[PDB]
Design a binder for this molecule. Structure first.
Ligand SMILES: Cc1cc2nc3c(=O)[nH]c(=O)nc-3n(C[C@H](O)[C@H](O)[C@H](O)COP(=O)(O)OP(=O)(O)OC[C@H]3O[C@@H](n4cnc5c(N)ncnc54)[C@H](O)[C@@H]3O)c2cc1C
Ligand SMILES: NC(=O)c1ccc[n+]([C@@H]2O[C@H](COP(=O)([O-])OP(=O)(O)OC[C@H]3O[C@@H](n4cnc5c(N)ncnc54)[C@H](O)[C@@H]3O)[C@@H](O)[C@H]2O)c1
Ligand SMILES: O=C(O)[C@H]1C[C@@H](O)CN1
Ligand SMILES: [Mg+2]
Length: 1214
């Protein structure tokens, strides 16, 4: 039995002094990075003047000497017409045969309806939009483009189509790439090679998703090396052409977490390509990618440079990104490696291509700082400083200065001084972008310095995939290429010396004012939880020791009553991934002590209620500090007790921290003397978020002033006991927070206890129904239903159309379906693929499936851990075998023998014929796939809704029409656009569904605390200026009937309603997080009096709902001659169970009438109903007898606005 965490994340090799200096700089504060860079980049006044003159000369030549602009001019096109035309030209070029395409244009496209003859034409419109307008729009307004394309064709006809086709053909065949194939690219390189340029070919592969894709990219590189080396014909690595590769193209799991696979499987592939480059004597450059791959790539560079089979060849090259804080230390390492190995490493210095993605990632992960600079001028200074370091080592490395910035170029040109020979260093530029600058540089008549052209090679599909990222390299507001084209930017501004400008700033190296550090994402409201960087070797080494120590601890969970720990039946808690690994011991609670705990809570309630809200909130904030400090140890417990991976355990502790701080802030914003607590609240939680959901429910109840009985899932008591220990250390009194470990019998005893004043339940819908049933014939001392929050299961779907990028879809599907072994309530259960792309995406998905590592989760390399119990495993496997027995296609990963010691289910894909093939939530790593025809999209949304669930939902599309359609018709609480559907963030995606998935209000949202007091406060930002028009029609009807007091109450409800609230919540860049209040649906009304019915109807209509009124009320004559608009929303119901499902209920009557109705309502099939009751007298006395908070439904929508390949908002941030 392997020791826990003994092999958690050992590095590839012991970290040298040079390597550790790199790691130390990873997230170094920006003010600490700049001063040494300023010092290193400093040049003499003589040089700075000479560089400025050269820079001015180059820029004057650039401005002294486009196709799309001339096309827009000739045909008077609007921007949308220009984009639509380029999309049409792109589509026409998918027709391979020239005569056939020309015939379609002449006889069909020009004459009118282009729709019939021509997957949306506008799939790549965000890319063409950048081309036409210079502005990035993340999604495509396909109805605007369709309108513009019809308009331009009907106005201008075949000539404009011809011009569009020929322009797109030139751009996609000769500008965005040097050629479609390596042979074509080589043929076109002769012209500039004769003038003194060289080439490095970029085959455009990246981000392999499957073994087959990595193999395809490998064979493309290998074939390109042969063609380039044949053409080099002995010219060598400096004069002759070379190749560039991306390591992410050569393995589907290129990551630090998979370091062993990288060294074992990716490294031999690079070596084979390098051996071929060596034989032809051409350059082979390793391109630089995301920041979390930098240090891992160094391990490959080290092995290759030390491998004697590659000796005698100096063509190995490596990119370093000057926007990165580690850049100078990476160069120190590379220069030393060059000295040790005797290989003259070709070092391409670039600024960096992934800036906006690095900002978003660091924010999402809650890390200490960014791994890149946040001011563009800082990158410029870094670049020049690293250039000085490189130019001092030309005996051992070959510097390659890749830049389009004439100021940067001139600074390095004069820095390098007067001595030059071919092979000392070179500049580089991008094909079809940098030639105007570099034709002022290459040649005996210019600056006589060589330039290597980075030459993309590929088909239209290949080049379009990540063209947005490449357009942003030189197209952002701060980009030199964009600025030199802006006539409002002077040459003096262009030649400004970044080194001196930074030096003279008040705070050298200050972070950009408009970019929040991850900890400050929420500003003054609350402090963001902090994560851990699992790509940082220092972090991995520190975490390894803390995790090991956590496994040595003797974790226990005891029934912690107000008077102290109680005796009970004790048993061990076993690691689900290996039952030989005992994690701790739990003493479980007798039914007698559970009842005793509620009585003690009831006796403790006044003392806890008297602690002022700000001080209760202070306890929560102290608890969050404690959990943040204890995160490494907490991770170890979650990993071993709950079978979670390290990344998921980090996210879980972060969620708990966020709950504590969010409910603390919401309390400080709202709670006052008039918001009295309910009393003892029973909090019952599931095993699958054994810290986060456990803590969230308890913290909310406590901060609202209620003593809590905490009943954690029987599977996961230890982390719950540790959460309670932390809350108590933070100042929560023992009488206010009691822990009752045990099974559902303990939960049921707590619910049934006489003094229970409210229940918070997260778990299965079936169990929630039993709790609902026990509460049905029960009332508070004030004669109202006992509040129940019941947040339950999902049958979560994702819809993917033919405009989505397969690689993005597959990554989001694999994560959403199989993260945590599918044991998230938010997990993806049903993937719906548009028929035309289904086979290609399915192939990729199955390939990605087999790249997952399943095993005990005390290893960083494990992607999917065990399921929680043997019972769960048997349940999940029974479902799989039933599907397999029905003839459905089933794909499964094979499991390692080591999994036999625990309870594992292999990630599984099941192909279904119809969504009805599924019955209930299958809580495991089981993805179901259905296909749909595009015209059936609306029916498909019906099918998703028809399950009765409504928790999470995902949509992958670039098309605004499809977004508007699908999001308006789906009925789910958490929507996700162009991203995964998991990991909802507290206060950013308030989490919770409708129907069979929840009663609400949402955990992590602003309505939550108001459910836990007897008089709900007004939440922050909670209002709407919109008035429901059916409510207004009803108020006029009431006035016409003479019911003046009820008409006024109706108008008051119309104003008080927050229906229509529509807010954007603060969160990370590159995402828009929206929170809206909608109608719940159809509310069951059970009135007793005429006035009661009118008040109930006003409340329901003001919140946008329809109603079913109990026909047994005998009040039909009270609603004669309703306006048609109101009548459309009103039905009368004799058999309530026939006329559902409902989304809530309003009841009027005395205590025993409420009890009888509540019992009948609980017996209705389907969703748990949030019921509100009032007496006739309370309706007369209290305008808020029925609280409008619970008659609206919260919807959270998270849209990935960077999905197109970049962040438009951050293009303005430099
Ligand atoms: C031949 C060649 C090879 C390349 N290889 C790679 C590669 O392997 N890996 C890679 O990542 N990219 C690569 N690039 C791209 C390069 O990193 C730059 O993104 C791009 O060329 C623009 O930089 P610049 O010096 O041309 O222009 P500039 O306009 O001077 O510089 C623009 C750059 O400034 C940086 N920047 C912009 N805003 C900010 C900000 N707010 N804070 C901090 N920095 C900011 C970004 O890096 C941006 O690209 C390559 C470029 C060329 C020409
Ligand atoms: N909507 C959400 O936010 C959300 C979040 C996480 C999990 N879930 C759901 O939770 C389920 C998985 O978690 P689980 O297996 O722990 O759920 P579960 O229903 O089996 O148990 C949840 C808790 O209820 C208790 N319980 C069982 N019977 C009870 C009874 N008769 N009376 C009172 N308490 C009783 C259990 O001991 C446990 O503490 C899934 O269906 C998942 O979708 C929902
Ligand atoms: O996994 C998720 O989406 C978040 C919300 C809740 O389910 C707990 N974790
Ligand atoms: Mg269960």
């Amino acid at each position: 039995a392997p020791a826990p965490f003994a092999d958690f994340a050992p590095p590839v090799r012991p970290q040298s002094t040079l390597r550790r200096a790199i790691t130390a700089a990873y997230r170094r504060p920006e003010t600490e990075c700049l001063p040494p860079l300023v010092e290193a980049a400093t040049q003499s006044k003589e040089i700075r003047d000479a560089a400025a003159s050269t820079a001015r000369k180059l820029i004057e030549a650039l401005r002294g000497k486009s196709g799309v602009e001339g096309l827009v001019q000739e045909y008077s096109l609007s921007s949308q017409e220009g984009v639509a035309l380029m999309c049409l030209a792109e589509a026409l070029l998918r027709i391979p045969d020239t005569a056939t395409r020309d015939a379609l244009i002449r006889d069909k496209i020009a004459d009118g309806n282009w729709k019939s003859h021509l997957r949306s034409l506008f799939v790549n419109a965000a890319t063409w939009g950048l081309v036409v307008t210079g502005k990035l729009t993340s999604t495509v307004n396909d109805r605007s483009l369709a309108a513009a394309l019809t308009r331009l064709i009907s106005r201008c006809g075949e000539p404009v189509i011809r011009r569009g086709v020929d322009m797109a053909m030139r751009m996609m065949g000769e500008q965005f790439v040097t050629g479609e194939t390596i042979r074509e690219a080589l043929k076109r390189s002769k012209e500039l090679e004769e003038k003194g340029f060289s080439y490095s070919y970029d085959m455009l592969g990246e981000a392999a998703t499957t073994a087959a894709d990595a193999e395809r990219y490998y064979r493309d590189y290998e074939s390109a090396i042969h063609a380039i080396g044949k053409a080099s014909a002995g010219r060598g690595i400096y004069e002759g052409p070379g190749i560039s590769i991306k390591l992410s193209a050569l393995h589907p799991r290129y990551s630090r977490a998979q370091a062993a696979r990288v060294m074992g499987e990716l490294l031999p592939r690079v070596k084979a390509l390098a051996l071929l480059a060596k034989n032809y004597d051409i350059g082979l450059n390793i391109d630089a990618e995301e920041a979390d791959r930098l240090e891992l790539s160094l391990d490959l560079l080290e092995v290759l440079c030390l491998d004697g089979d590659l000796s005698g060849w100096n063509g190995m090259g490596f990119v370093v990104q000057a926007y990165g804080k580690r850049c100078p230390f990476v160069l120190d390492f590379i220069i030393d490696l060059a000295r040790r190995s005797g290989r003259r490493i070709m070092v391409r210095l670039v600024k960096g291509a992934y800036w906006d993605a690095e900002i978003k990632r660091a924010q999402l992960d809650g890390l200490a700082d960014f791994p890149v600079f946040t001011r563009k001028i800082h990158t410029d200074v870094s670049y020049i400083a690293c250039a000085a370091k490189l130019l001092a080592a030309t005996d051992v490395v070959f510097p390659q200065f890749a830049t389009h910035n004439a100021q940067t170029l001139a600074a390095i040109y004069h820095m390098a001084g007067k001595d030059f020979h071919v092979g000392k260093y070179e500049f580089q530029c991008l094909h079809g972008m940098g030639e105007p600058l570099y034709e002022e540089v290459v040649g005996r008549g210019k600056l006589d310095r060589p330039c290597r052209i980075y030459a993309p090679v590929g088909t239209h599909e290949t080049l379009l995939a990540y063209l947005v990222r490449r357009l942003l390299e030189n197209g952002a507001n701060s980009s030199f290429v964009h600025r030199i084209n802006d006539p409002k930017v002077s040459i003096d501004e262009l030649i400004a010396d970044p080194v001196e400008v930074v030096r003279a700033m008040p705070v050298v190296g200050a972070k950009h004012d408009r970019i929040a550090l991850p900890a400050e994402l929420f500003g003054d409201a609350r402090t963001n939880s902090a994560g851990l960087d699992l790509s940082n070797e220092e972090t991995l080494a520190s975490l390894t020791e803390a995790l090991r120590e956590s496994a040595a601890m003797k974790w226990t969970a005891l029934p912690q009553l107000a008077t102290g720990p109680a005796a009970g039946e004790t048993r061990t808690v076993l690691n689900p991934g290996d039952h030989r690994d005992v994690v701790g011991s739990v003493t479980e609670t007798s039914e007698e002590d559970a009842r005793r705990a509620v009585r003690l809570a009831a006796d403790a309630a006044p003392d806890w209620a008297a602690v002022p809200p700000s001080e209760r909130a202070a306890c929560l904030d102290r608890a969050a500090e404690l959990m943040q400090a204890r995160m490494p140890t907490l991770l170890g417990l979650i990993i071993r007790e709950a079978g979670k991976s390290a990344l998921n355990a980090i996210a879980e502790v972060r969620e708990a921290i966020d709950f504590l701080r969010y409910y603390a802030e919401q309390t400080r914003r709202t709670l006052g003397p008039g918001h009295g607590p309910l009393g003892p609240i029973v909090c019952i939680s599931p095993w699958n978020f054994p810290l986060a959901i456990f803590t969230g429910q308890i913290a909310a109840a406590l901060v609202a002033g209620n003593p809590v009985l905490a009943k954690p899932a029987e599977e996961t008591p230890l982390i719950a006991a540790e959460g309670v220990r932390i809350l108590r250390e933070a100042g929560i009194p023992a009488s206010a927070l009691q822990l009752l470990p045990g099974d559902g019998r303990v939960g049921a005893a707590l619910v049934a206890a006489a003094e229970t004043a409210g229940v918070m339940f997260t778990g299965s819908t079936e169990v929630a129904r039993l709790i609902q049933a026990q509460l049905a014939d029960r009332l508070s001392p004030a004669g109202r239903p006992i509040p129940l929050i019941a947040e339950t299961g999902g049958q979560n779907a994702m819809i993917v159309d033919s405009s989505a990028l397969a690689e993005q879809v597959v990554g989001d599907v694999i994560t959403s379906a199989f993260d945590s072994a599918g044991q998230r309530c938010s997990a993806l259960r049903v993937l719906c693929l548009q028929e035309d792309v289904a086979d290609r995406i399915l192939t990729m998905l199955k390939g990605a499936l087999h790249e997952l590592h399943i095993g005990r989760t005390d290893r960083l390399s494990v992607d999917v851990g065990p399921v929680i119990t043997s019972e769960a495993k048997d349940n999940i496997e029974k479902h799989i075998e039933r599907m397999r027995g029905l003839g459905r296609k089933v794909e499964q990963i094979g499991l390692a023998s080591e999994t036999g010691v625990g309870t594992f289910v292999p990630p599984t894909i099941i192909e279904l014929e119809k969504l009805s093939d599924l019955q209930r939530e299958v809580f495991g790593p089981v993805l179901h796939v259905i296909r749909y025809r595009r015209d059936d999209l609306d029916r498909l949304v019906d099918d998703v809704n028809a399950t009765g669930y409504g928790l999470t939902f995902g949509l992958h599309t670039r098309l605004d029409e499809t977004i508007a359609h699908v999001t308006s018709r789906i009925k789910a609480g958490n929507l996700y656009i162009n991203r995964n559907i998991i990991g909802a963030v507290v206060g950013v995606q308030p989490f919770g569904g409708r129907g069979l998935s929840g009663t609400g209000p949402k955990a992590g949202g602003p309505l939550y605390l108001g459910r836990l007091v007897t008089t709900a406060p007004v939440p922050p930002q909670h209002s709407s200026v919109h008035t429901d028009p059916v409510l207004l029609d009803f108020a006029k009807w009431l006035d016409g009937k003479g019911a003046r007091a009820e008409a006024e109450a109706a108008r008051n409800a119309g104003s008080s309603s927050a229906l229509g609230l529509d807010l954007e919540l603060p969160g990370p860049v590159g995402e828009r997080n929206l929170y809206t209040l909608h109608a719940r649906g159809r509310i069951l009304l059970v009135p007793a009096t005429e006035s009661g019915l009118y008040h109930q109807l006003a409340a329901a209509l003001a919140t946008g709902n329809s109603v079913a009124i109990d026909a047994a009320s005998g009040l039909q004559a009270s609603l004669k001659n309703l306006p048609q608009t109101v009548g459309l929303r009103v039905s009368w119901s004799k058999d309530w169970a026939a006329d559902g499902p409902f989304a809530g209920a309003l009841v009027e009557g005395d205590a025993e009438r409420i009890r009888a109705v509540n019992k009948a309502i609980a017996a209705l099939p389907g969703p748990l109903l949030l019921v509100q009751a009032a007496s006739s007298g309370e309706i007369a006395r209290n305008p808020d007898a029925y609280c409008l908070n619970w008659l609206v439904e919260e919807v959270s929508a998270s849209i990935n606005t960077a999905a197109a390949g970049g962040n438009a908002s951050l293009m303005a941030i430099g």
